[PDB]
Structure 1
Amino acid sequence: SVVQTVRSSFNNINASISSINAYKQAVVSAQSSLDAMEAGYSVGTRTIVDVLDA
C-alpha cells in the first residue's frame, strides 16, 4: 500500500505542473482578447456588452 501511495502522489505532482502551464497560457489568451475588444470599443466598432463579457 505504501508503494502504490507514494507512486500516485508523485504522478499527481507532475500533473499539477502541467495543468499550471496550461492555465497560464489560457490567461494570456483571454487578456489578448480583452485588449482587442476594448480597443474596438474605444474606436467605436463594438458595444460595451462585449467588454463586460471579455
Structure 2
Amino acid sequence: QTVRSSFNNINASISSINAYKQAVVSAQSSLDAMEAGYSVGTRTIVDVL
C-alpha cells in the first residue's frame, strides 16, 4: 500500500508542478500588462504593486 501511495504521490506532484508553472506564467503576463498600462498612464502605482 505504501509503495502504491508513493507512486501516485509522485505523479500528482508532477501534475501540480505543471499547473503552478502555468499559473506563474499567467501572473507574469498580468504584471507586465499592469506595468505597461502604468507607463502609458492608465494605471496607478498601487495596481502594479
Match status 1:39 vs 2:9: no
> Root-mean-square deviation (CA), in Å?
0.3
TM-score, normalised on structure 2?
A: 0.98
Structure 1 or 2, whichever has the larger Rg, is 1
Deviation for aligned residue 1:32: 0.4
Match status 1:15 vs 2:16: no
3-state SS of 2:9 partner: helix
Q: Which runs of 5+ in 2 are unaligned?
A: none
Deviation for aligned residue 1:21: 0.1
Poorly superposed stretches of 4+, deviation over 6 Å: none
Percent identity, aligned pairs only? 100
Matched residue count: 49
3-state SS of 1:17 partner: helix
Q: Which runs of 5+ in 1 are unaligned?
A: none
The structure with higher relative contact order (CA 8 Å, sep 6+) is: 1
